[PDB]
């Protein structure tokens, strides 16, 4: 049986949500007793850090905070590919994936339109072989049941999300 360290791996675009929404979500998860990995380290280099690949491998699930500029970061997209790989392949337990669409249209993520399309236009031929796997991972994640968020009080929205994740993860833990 595989090593498990976290209940949730938190995938987010720092420039959009690091200091606000995802921080409030992170601290709400912990108040529920959900062991959550939220990267706070300085990182350098093109490749995704090995520590991040390992955290994902050792998490029962990922929460993806999709936001306007998520697909503008090659690190977020490589991360997402690793998450959806585990989602498909990881057994006993699985790797559940919970997408939040934070002021973004799920359809833009699914089809790589709007700001997600613009991101893909911004990449060059340097990264052309990464682009197919990036698209597949965005489409698969966007086809999962999750939470589109736009209007309303954020504190109660986070409470409901974390109550839902808590219950879904406790039932699987059996």
Per the omega criterion (within 30 degrees of 0), is the bond before 167 cis? no
Determine the 3-state secondary structure of 65 from DSSP: strand
Is 13 flagged in the annotation as binding?
yes
Tell me the Cα Rg of the chain: 15
Task: State the burial class of residue 80 (Cβ atoms within 10 Å of its Cβ: 0-12, 13-18, 19+).
Answer: buried
Task: Determine whether 79 is an active site residue.
Answer: yes
DSSP per-residue string spanning 11-30: EE-HHHHTTTHHHHHHHHHH
Task: State the burial class of residue 152 (Cβ atoms within 10 Å of its Cβ: 0-12, 13-18, 19+).
Answer: exposed
The structural domain count of the chain equals: 1
- CA angle at 43 for the pair 93 and 50, rounded to the nearest 5°: 35
Q: How far apart are CA 95 and CA 74, in angstroms?
A: 22
Q: 173 — phi, psi (to 5°)?
A: -60, -30
Q: Are 158 and 29 in contact (CB under 8 A)?
A: no
Which of 21, 16, 53, 48 lies closest to 37, judged by CA? Answer: 53
Q: How far apart are CA 150 and CA 82, in angstroms?
A: 27
Is 16 flagged in the annotation as binding?
yes
Which of 70, 130, 67, 124 lies closest to 101, judged by CA? Answer: 67
Which of 58, 68, 79, 154 is catalytic? The answer is 79
DSSP per-residue string spanning 121-144: HH--GGGTTTHHHHHHHHHHHHTS
Q: Which residues pair with 147 in a beta bridge?
A: 100
Q: Are 56 and 116 in contact (CB under 8 A)?
A: no
Q: Which residues pair with 28 in a beta bridge?
A: none
Domain that holds residue 166: 1-174
Q: How far apart are CA 27 and CA 93, in angstroms?
A: 25
Sequence-ordered alpha helix ranges (H) in the chain: 14-17, 21-31, 50-57, 74-89, 106-111, 114-122, 131-142, 154-173
Task: State the burial class of residue 128 (Cβ atoms within 10 Å of its Cβ: 0-12, 13-18, 19+).
Answer: exposed
Task: State the burial class of residue 63 (Cβ atoms within 10 Å of its Cβ: 0-12, 13-18, 19+).
Answer: buried
Is 15 flagged in the annotation as binding?
yes
Q: Are 82 and 51 in contact (CB under 8 A)?
A: no
Task: State the burial class of residue 22 (Cβ atoms within 10 Å of its Cβ: 0-12, 13-18, 19+).
Answer: buried
| Sign of the torsion angle spanned by Cα atoms 165, 1, 85, 139 | negative
């Amino acid at each position: 049986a595989r090593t498990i360290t976290y209940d949730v791996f938190l995938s987010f675009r720092g420039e959009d949500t690091r200091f606000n929404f995802t921080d409030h979500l992170y601290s709400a998860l912990g108040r529920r007793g959900i062991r959550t990995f939220r990267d706070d380290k300085l990182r350098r280099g093109e490749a995704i850090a090995p520590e991040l690949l390992k955290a994902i491998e050792e998490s029962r699930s990922s929460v993806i905070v999709f936001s306007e500029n998520y697909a503008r970061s090659r690190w977020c997209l490589d991360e997402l590919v690793k998450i959806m790989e585990c989602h498909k392949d990881k057994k006993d337990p699985g790797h559940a994936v919970f997408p939040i669409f934070y002021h973004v249209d799920p359809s833009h993520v699914r089809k790589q339109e709007g700001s997600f399309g613009e991101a893909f236009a911004g990449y060059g031929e340097n990264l052309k072989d990464k682009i197919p796997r990036w698209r597949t991972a965005l489409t698969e994640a966007a086809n999962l049941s999750g939470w589109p968020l736009q209007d309303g009080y954020e504190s109660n929205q986070i409470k409901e999300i974390t109550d839902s994740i808590f219950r879904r993860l406790k039932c699987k833990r059996l």
